[PDB]
Each structure stands twice: as C-alpha cells, then as structure tokens.
Amino acid sequence: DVQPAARGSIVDRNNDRLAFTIEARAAERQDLRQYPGGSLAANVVGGIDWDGHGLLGLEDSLDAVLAGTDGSVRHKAVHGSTVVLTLDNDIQFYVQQQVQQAKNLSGAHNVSAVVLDAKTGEVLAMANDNTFDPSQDIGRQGDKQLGNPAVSSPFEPGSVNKIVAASAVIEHGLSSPDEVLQVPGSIQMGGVTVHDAWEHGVMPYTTTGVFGKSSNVGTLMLSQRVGPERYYDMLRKFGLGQRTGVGLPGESAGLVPPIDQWSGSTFANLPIGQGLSMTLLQMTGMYQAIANDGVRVPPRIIKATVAPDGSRTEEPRPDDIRVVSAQTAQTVRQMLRAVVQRDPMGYQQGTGPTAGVPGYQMAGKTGTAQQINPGCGCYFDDVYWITFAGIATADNPRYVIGIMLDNPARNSDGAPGHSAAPLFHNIAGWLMQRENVPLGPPLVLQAT
Ligand SMILES: *C(=O)[C@@H](NC(=O)[C@H](N)c1ccc(O)cc1)[C@@H]1N[C@@H](C(=O)O)C(C)(C)S1
Ligand SMILES: [Co+2]
Ligand SMILES: [Co+2]
Ligand SMILES: [Co+2]
Ligand SMILES: [Co+2]
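That is the input. Now the predicted structure with AXL docked in place:
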C-alpha cells in the first residue's frame, strides 16, 4: 500500500502562489494542479502532465523537488518542497501584458522582456508574447508560445552590444566621454566596408555621441584602440557565449567565435553586435554588470526552497565577476543617458529619446540587428531584431530592463519606426511610480 507525496507549490518572491495542488477525486483520489494566474509567467512555471508530474518548464525541471517521493508500508512520505522564485508577480503581470501589446502594436513576430534587480541580478520579470495557459490542454495550444525564448532563443544583438566597446575603451583609459572625435561616414576595416545608418561627412561626435547616436564607424574607431584581445577578453567577462546558470530549462549559451578562429572581418563586426548571438537574458545581464558598479552577478530565478516542515533554505548566491571598475561603470551609465536625450534641434539627440522618463536619469542603448536570410547565407536588408536595454536609474540603479522585438513593422507603441524604446519608457516609468522614487546640464553628443 502506497502513501502519495503531496506536490509542492511554486510561488513568487512574496509567496504569491503561481502553482499549487488541491486534492480531488475521479485511481479514486486525484490531485489537481491549479494556476490561479493562468498564463502569468507560464513561460517560466510550465505545466503539468496527466500523471501529476511536470510536463515542461520548472514543473518538469524541478519535478524531483516539487514531487517529493512516495512513502510505503515502512517508509515515510517525503512531500514536495515549495519553490520560491525571484519573480515579483505584480511586475511580471505588468511586463507580460505590456509585452503582449507591444507585439500587437508593433507587428513583430514576437516580443520578450527581462527585468533584473540591478544589484543582485535576480530575475524580477521574464515574459514573452503569446504565452500559453497551463490550466488548459497543451495539445490544443499549438498556436501558443509554450517555451521561454528569453533564455532559449539567441539573436544577434546589433548595437546594444556597443556597451562592450564603451566599457573597454573607458576601462583601459583609451578615451573619455568628452573626447571630440572625427568620424567619417564609412571606413574600410578587416577587408570590409562599414557604414553608419545615416549619410554624413566627418562629424565631430563626442565619444558620448558615438554611443548616443550609435555611430558604427565611431564604435569601430574606438574599438581599434582596444584591440581584439582586450575586446574579446571583455566579451568573455560580460558573460557572452556562456550559460548564466539561471536555473531554467533549455537555456542557450549563444555564440561567440573564439579569438583563435576569427577571420579578417570578425573584429569589424563583433563591436557593433553582428557575428555573434546572445539570449535576451545574457543581453540584460551585461547591463546589470554596468548597473552594479561593474560587478556582474549571474541572474537567478530560484530564490529559495521551503521544506515540507516549513524550514526555508535560500539559494546559494553566485560568485561576483568584476568586469570593469566602479568608476568605469558609473561613467558608462552617465554616457548612456545620451541615448535617451531629446534635442529639438537634432544635434544633441540620441537614438532613443522616447525611452527617457523626465525626472529620472534613465540610461540605455538601442539596437537594430539584421537577421540572417536563411535562403542565401547572407543578411536580410529589411528584417531586424530590435533591442533596447536600460537601467533605472543611472544615479541609483535599481532595475535593468532588456527588450527584443522580432522584426516589428512599427514602434512598440504603434507609431511609425522600429523602436523598442517606448516599451522601455512604459516599464521603467511604471517601476519608478510604484516605488514612489523621487525626481543636470545637457550632454554633448556633437561638438562644433
Ligand atoms: C546598431 O544596431 C547599428 N545598426 C546597424 O548597423 C544596422 N546594420 C542597421 C543599419 C541601418 C538601418 O536602417 C538599420 C540597421 C546602429 N544602431 C541602430 C540603432 O537603432 O541604434 C541604428 C541607429 C539604426 S544604426
Ligand atoms: Co525498506
Ligand atoms: Co555613404
Ligand atoms: Co520602416
Ligand atoms: Co510617457
């Protein structure tokens, strides 16, 4: 005769329940899995099988923790432990809803977003559009997203990768935010030709402006100062090409070609974010490093487990990784404020003015990466991954936000363009309001 273990529950950081079991009947007694939020975080949480064991998601990957072990008679029943996630359901719900309507408004194939706690790298929200509902039969949801693209599905970052170049060039003392540069409209590098997204003669962009206006040419000129080895070294320190260990099934490691295999043109591509791929989580994790004064903390979604008696064990914190100094990180945060700076005369406006929130030192970076055309082995001309990653706020980092839009026809808010900045605006602005966070001179992107 068998004594069944009672399945543990999955809850958020404040013990708001995401998944829990109730006892019912039909093989007479039947345990019913409940999902009071429906699709809420179902990309992370997953769903249950007919036998009451995990089918996919954390229900499956932590099944042994959640299922326990059945007793007998004499062996006692080890009931399932409760899993406490780092997620905040309120933030998850808002972000997940905003991700869905950015996908609707923008016409993108898909949208995903990640919010990290800036100091600890804990995952506060992780969402994609079209999230399935685990309270319903999965075979009836082939049109739904059943997985977790934010960790499983790498993409080329494009210009949001320029945080690496910016971090290296400041960390090695090779430039400063105010340095006046001379930036041609194109250069020949590594045997290939790199253009800026707008035609221009030599422009007196500051280093700040190179990243604020997202000059590819300016980025490569600065990267020539870093050199491949210090640049590749910093890619590795920012954690690219390597799984984070976040504790979710199906995490991709992405792809960074090791320096021993680069072609002549590789260095002309990586610093502007093409020729490598990363997940949204890796992307957001890079900006977490700069937000946490240069110390990257690998993100984590399991906060703790609670044993059946009620004793709580915290998850072990991952080891700090210093990427750049605190001084360098603070300088990059300030400089990325220029990305969201507005200028009616155009000259001192970054690529993402709609992402700024007046009253706050928002800092971030836009991205537009060309996707590979699967039929030619070559890049599409008009098919993009759109990215934004930012920090709320530069003077007091609390939240890191990463966003990717898969080839939108419009802005995330539905206006003409291809920008994820309005979605950052909405999320970061709402995060400041709800915590009642309180409120200098304009930055120079372009000299004379
Ligand atoms: C980084 O993402 C850069 N983008 C490109 O170089 C890309 N090939 C591209 C060129 C021209 C387009 O019309 C679209 C993509 C720079 N960063 C982008 C950004 O949004 O920040 C641009 C400013 C578009 S160029
Ligand atoms: Co025995
Ligand atoms: Co030209
Ligand atoms: Co267009
Ligand atoms: Co607004």
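The radius of gyration is 23 Å.
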